[PDB]
Amino acid sequence: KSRLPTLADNEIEYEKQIGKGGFGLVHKGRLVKDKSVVAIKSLILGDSEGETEMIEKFQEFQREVFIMSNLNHPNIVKLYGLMHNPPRMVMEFVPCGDLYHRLLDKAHPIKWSVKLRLMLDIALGIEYMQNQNPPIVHRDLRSPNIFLQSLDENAPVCAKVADFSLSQQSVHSVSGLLGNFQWMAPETIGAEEESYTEKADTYSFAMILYTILTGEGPFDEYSYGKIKFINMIREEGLRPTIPEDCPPRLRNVIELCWSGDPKKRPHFSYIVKELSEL
Numbered sequence: 001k002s003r004l005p006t007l008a009d010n011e012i013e014y015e016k017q018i019g020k021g022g023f024g025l026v027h028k029g030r031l032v033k034d035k036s037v038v039a040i041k042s043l044i045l046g047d048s049e050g051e052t053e054m055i056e057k058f059q060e061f062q063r064e065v066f067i068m069s070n071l072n073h074p075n076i077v078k079l080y081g082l083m084h085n086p087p088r089m090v091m092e093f094v095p096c097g098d099l100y101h102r103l104l105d106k107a108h109p110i111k112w113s114v115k116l117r118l119m120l121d122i123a124l125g126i127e128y129m130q131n132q133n134p135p136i137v138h139r140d141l142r143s144p145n146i147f148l149q150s151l152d153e154n155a156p157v158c159a160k161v162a163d164f165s166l167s168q169q170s171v172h173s174v175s176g177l178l179g180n181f182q183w184m185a186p187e188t189i190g191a192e193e194e195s196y197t198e199k200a201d202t203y204s205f206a207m208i209l210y211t212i213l214t215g216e217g218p219f220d221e222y223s224y225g226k227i228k229f230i231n232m233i234r235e236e237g238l239r240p241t242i243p244e245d246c247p248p249r250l251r252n253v254i255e256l257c258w259s260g261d262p263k264k265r266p267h268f269s270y271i272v273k274e275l276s277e278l
């Protein structure tokens with residue numbers, strides 16, 4: 001973790017509450033120095049919460065700080081600095097919501113050229129993450145965690161990776177169960193203490209590729225009980241059906257990225273190269 005700048009209450013102008021996070025509130029603001037629109041994420045552990053949930057909220061907030069302090073890439077949501085009383089993160093405001101809510105608008109499909117811009121922007125973000133020393137394992141890559149800067153095909157940045165808790169950056173492999181099984185690698189969801197790497201994010205990216213391509217949620221075509229669903233993904237190689245009209249080069253990238261064997265999941269230099277050829 002590198003140096004993180006501190007900003008006093010004098011250096012920001014609160015505008016409105018824009019959302020509600022896992023550990024507190026989210027506000028829209030302005031940086032008084034250069035008039036930059038910002039998102040302020042506060043850490044509020046109310047005395048209504050229990051012991052185990054309160055410590056999970058603090059460690060969640062701090063991991064996001066520790067990981068984001070080293071990050072500097074146009075396709076990753078940027079940390080401007082920290083605030084105290086209450087502990088707050090000052091983030092760059094990303095004006096066009098998230099990928100999840102945009103894809104729900106079935107009446108207005110994202111055109112093919114912008115879809116490609118989104119795919120590449122996210123891949124570049126994750127490529128940068130996996131090129132870190134040690135590599136960053138997001139552990140929560142899904143359409144709600146992809147923020148949209150612009151839907152214009154000619155924009156400098158269209159998509160940005162966001163929400164870096166539950167994220168890890170270690171010289172040794174990580175472990176732990178992950179909840180959202182429709183987005184997460186088989187080696188992460190099998191109700192055990194299994195070891196995995198950044199290749200779990202490569203699996204998640206394949207689901208992101210599917211959701212952009214189709215506009216649909218991964219695994220929504222199937223309906224199983226939780227235990228059965230996990231077993232099908234793990235042991236039976238259950239995957240979302242790629243439509244017949246998908247470009248052969250994209251289909252290969254998706255298929256390879258959601259391989260049951262994590263070693264067969266490609267390096268992102270290959271992923272970026274292949275996507276750019278679309």
Ligand SMILES: Nc1ncnc2c1ncn2[C@@H]1O[C@H](COP(=O)(O)OP(=O)(O)CP(=O)(O)O)[C@@H](O)[C@H]1O
Nearest residue numbers: 018019020021022026039077091092093094095163
């Ligand atoms: N950098 C940013 N730019 C623009 N809006 C942002 C933003 N950061 C947060 N928001 C807004 O605040 C809302 C609060 O959600 P947040 O960003 O805290 O994710 P979350 O912690 O709720 C994901 P989950 O709890 O499901 O793991 C978001 O839905 C978004 O609308």
Ligand SMILES: [Mg+2]
Nearest residue numbers: 140163165166
């Ligand atoms: Mg998260």
